[PDB]
């Protein structure tokens, strides 16, 4: 199992790529980098990179204004970006009943949010986009955004418990508690149907994968291990971890600084834990750069190391020149 | 609210001080430093620093061999350390309780935790009732302390609990509530009642903000911030007083050095960001900001020099040379 994302970058079967990682972990740089690498490597296919971050992280990363309308990133004719706010008559009753459910039932809020992002995609495609071959999902930093994948099971198990209890005695008691009951069954069952359809593609490892992003630090390893467990319970394919902010301190010409040297001793300790824990994962080890990486130019030079492993002995020049 | 633990260090009211923080966050160094500061500021009192870490963190921190029997740290007149393993001690006591149940087995019964473990019944309920494992484990530590307080004037005035690196140690504080419900349903119930009453007695002191407090330990990074928020919320749910956060491993990079190593400068920039977040989120807390030292900080000498910055705020302009001295 190669310490790179080369097989993903050149894959012609994947249409849905999720990228995620909590805690200032280089996630958005990684999303941008994966999108660039795939677009450069497959110039015949059209790629979309989409974010739901209210901070407009893609606009910040590329240095240009992105929005709800898909726009090509300047310098590419192959990659487009979107930034959408997914948070943004009987329908008022239908919505109010459904709003009450988002707070108490896990997966409903996430389903409605993701259904909205999918609506934005197909709208951009029909209105001369014209069709994206693969979508890179830059996942939100907060929340468990793929939780909707457990919803079809959650709410069918709830319907059976509903079916067991209601059939006790009635219809005296049934009509009393069900008085003024807004049905919302048709709106709920179509949501279940929409998820089950999405699940068919998202649980297919040839069509969909999740790339985890982390740093070589105790709490980030902890967060990564739980992220992977969450994704396994969704039956979502995960075999890629990007480890960012690595110092490779023993290498740099202009050595010294013990603070940095001690920090890399600790990073190396958790790297050995990652190597041992994730033996059959693509664990791609990415160098720290001075500042954050912004602009198409710096993003492509840095992104290359997702495809062919960074070698601190030879590639140091490239990094200390992005700086 | 001052960015130090001065009022805690000089408090003649506190009996139980908990120190905790997960992630390699300087927790052991903070426990030791709190213990040293209190013992130096209150020479007329006797202090116990106790650890429950099987890796023997206090022995490694002081460069002395500590254990089950309380020992004064060399160079100190009024600070002693203990290192025990309550889970391993409970497993041993429980195995014997089960062995006495299977055979025709009597008990000494003259109190207290030994009576709770009868038949091993309470121990195999630890999987269905949260807080039991933690209650019995903490009963083990209280037992060891009371035994160590011999008979004579060898009773400690204040105990500093260096909390274990793993688990939710103080979860037992929720027990009296979860057991009052459970038993509202509902020999075994007799043991549940003895346990509930035991924890309620602890609560009288552990929920008294004058007697008991918890010091959180973190680092200035996103995940450590949210882990600390999580810890704080946990302690609030226990009615544990918590109004102190120690932030370790701070570079203060713009000072001391100058402009050398931009990687440290970049790191310090990120630290300032979350330091600002912490300052605002926890405005009523003592937020104590502690410098990074190149290396460990081990031994009484280095630990007492470092620990002074818990009492009086580290000033990067003034105190940089002290960190170089270590
Ligand atoms: Cl997204
Ligand atoms: Cl997720
Ligand atoms: Mg990020
Ligand atoms: Mg530690
Ligand atoms: Na006996
Ligand atoms: Na302890
Ligand atoms: Na706890
Ligand atoms: Zn440095």
């Amino acid at each position: 199992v190669e310490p790179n994302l080369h097989s993903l970058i050149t894959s012609t079967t994947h249409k849905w790529i999720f990228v995620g990682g909590k805690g200032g972990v280089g996630k958005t740089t990684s999303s941008c980098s994966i999108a660039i690498q795939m677009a450069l490597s497959q110039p015949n296919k059209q790629f979309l990179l989409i974010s739901t971050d209210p901070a407009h992280n893609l606009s910040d990363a590329f240095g240009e204004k992105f929005g709800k309308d898909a726009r090509k990133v300047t310098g590419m004719n192959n990659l487009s970006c979107m930034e959408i706010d997914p948070s943004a008559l009987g329908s008022l009753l239908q919505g109010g009943a459904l709003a009450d459910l988002t707070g108490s039932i896990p997966g409903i809020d996430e389903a409605l949010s993701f259904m909205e992002v999918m609506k934005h995609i197909k709208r951009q495609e029909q209105g001369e986009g014209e069709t994206f071959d693969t979508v890179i999902f830059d996942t939100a930093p907060t929340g468990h955004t793929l939780r909707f994948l457990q919803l079809p099971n959650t709410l069918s198990k709830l319907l059976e418990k509903f079916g067991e209890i209601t059939n006790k005695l009635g219809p005296m008691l049934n009509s009393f508690m069900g008085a003024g009951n807004v049905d919302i069954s048709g709106k709920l069952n179509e949501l279940k149907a929409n998820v089950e359809t999405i699940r068919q593609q998202f649980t297919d490892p040839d069509l969909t994968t999740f790339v985890c992003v982390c740093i070589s630090e105790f709490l980030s390893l902890y967060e990564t291990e739980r992220l992977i467990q969450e994704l396994i319970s969704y039956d979502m394919d995960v075999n890629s971890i990007i480890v960012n902010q690595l110092l490779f301190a023993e290498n740099d010409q202009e050595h010294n600084c013990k603070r940095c040297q001690a920090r890399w001793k600790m990073q190396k300790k958790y790297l050995d834990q990652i190597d041992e824990l994730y033996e059959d994962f693509h664990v791609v080890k990415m160098p720290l750069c001075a500042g954050e990486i912004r602009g198409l130019n710096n993003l492509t030079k840095f992104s290359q190391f997702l495809n062919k492993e960074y070698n601190p002995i030879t590639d140091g020049k490239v990094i200390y020149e992005l700086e």
Side-chain angles (χ1 to χ4, degrees), chain A:
Chain A
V1 189
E2 289 198 359
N4 60 55
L5 298 183
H6 176 249
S7 73
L8 214 216
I9 284 154
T10 60
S11 175
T12 48
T13 63
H14 294 262
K15 35 201 290 196
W16 320 107
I17 319 283
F18 291 88
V19 184
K22 185 199 183 197
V25 94
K27 173 203 66 79
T28 100
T29 305
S30 296
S31 293
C32 297
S33 293
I34 292 163
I36 289 159
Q37 278 302 301
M38 292 190 77
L40 295 180
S41 298
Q42 310 180 236
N44 58 314
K45 296 284 192 263
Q46 289 285 152
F47 298 85
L48 185 267
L49 172 61
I50 179 152
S51 173
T52 57
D53 199 6
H56 290 265
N57 59 331
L58 300 183
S59 285
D60 182 73
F62 284 100
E64 56 184 327
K65 298 190 171 176
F66 296 117
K68 63 186 282 178
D69 297 291
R71 297 215 302 102
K72 297 274 191 72
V73 341
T74 312
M76 311 276 308
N77 72 290
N78 209 28
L79 178 63
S80 299
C81 292
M82 279 173 71
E83 282 173 331
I84 53 165
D85 190 32
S87 180
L89 191 66
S91 192
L92 293 330
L93 286 84
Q94 211 90 11
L98 212 58
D100 196 25
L101 256 19
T102 58
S104 53
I105 300 175
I108 285 170
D109 196 60
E110 290 82 349
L112 291 160
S113 178
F114 199 80
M115 278 309 293
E116 278 295 319
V117 319
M118 292 293 84
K119 284 189 196 77
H120 280 283
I121 311 279
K122 59 166 182 65
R123 193 208 291 159
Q124 289 296 305
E125 290 182 320
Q126 275 290 261
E128 278 72 15
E130 173 128 278
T131 177
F132 302 111
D133 298 292
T134 108
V135 178
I136 322 278
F137 298 99
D138 173 69
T139 65
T142 54
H144 305 269
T145 45
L146 283 169
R147 195 134 68 186
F148 65 90
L149 293 171
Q150 280 183 336
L151 182 69
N153 176 243
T154 307
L155 93 195
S156 75
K157 285 217 292 283
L158 261 51
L159 278 161
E160 289 193 67
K161 288 179 76 181
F162 180 80
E164 282 167 35
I165 293 150
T166 49
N167 283 253
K168 71 210 156 296
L169 289 161
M172 188 80 72
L173 194 53
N174 295 257
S175 305
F176 177 81
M177 53 180 67
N181 188 249
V182 177
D183 209 331
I184 55 97
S185 287
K187 225 84 175 291
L188 180 150
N189 282 131
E190 73 132 47
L191 189 68
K192 186 191 185 179
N194 285 313
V195 173
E196 283 170 352
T197 302
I198 289 160
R199 288 200 81 259
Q200 285 177 224
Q201 301 210 20
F202 281 17
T203 58
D204 183 340
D206 286 323
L207 298 180
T208 314
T209 199
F210 195 109
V211 181
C212 301
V213 186
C214 76
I215 59 177
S216 210
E217 302 196 7
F218 181 100
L219 289 165
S220 185
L221 301 214
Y222 198 94
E223 166 61 38
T224 304
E225 175 64 11
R226 68 138 294 282
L227 211 208
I228 296 161
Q229 288 306 118
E230 192 201 341
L231 298 161
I232 288 162
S233 74
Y234 300 152
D235 298 308
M236 247 255 68
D237 184 80
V238 279
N239 69 350
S240 309
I241 306 181
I242 298 164
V243 196
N244 286 323
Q245 304 180 11
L246 298 174
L247 284 161
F248 306 101
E250 286 164 335
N251 292 287
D252 74 324
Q253 258 300 255
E254 183 212 324
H255 289 257
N256 291 207
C257 186
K258 273 85 90 178
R259 312 279 234 204
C260 276
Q261 212 60 63
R263 186 190 153 195
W264 197 59
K265 284 181 188 178
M266 206 68 81
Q267 286 186 346
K268 207 144 52 85
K269 173 195 180 182
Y270 294 110
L271 274 181
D272 295 342
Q273 286 192 193
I274 291 163
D275 288 332
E276 200 200 302
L277 225 179
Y278 301 111
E279 229 153 309
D280 58 23
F281 281 57
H282 295 103
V283 172
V284 30
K285 293 165 178 180
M286 295 295 284
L288 179 81
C289 304
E292 88 292 71
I293 295 153
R294 287 180 191 172
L296 217 219
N297 285 359
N298 292 344
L299 283 169
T300 111
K301 296 184 73 173
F302 177 78
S303 76
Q304 79 183 100
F305 304 119
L306 299 173
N307 182 253
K308 183 199 194 297
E309 308 87 276
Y310 180 75
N311 184 340
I313 303 285
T314 55
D315 296 310
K317 293 173 184 181
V318 182
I319 293 312
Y320 301 92
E321 156 185 278
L322 291 173
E323 158 258 346

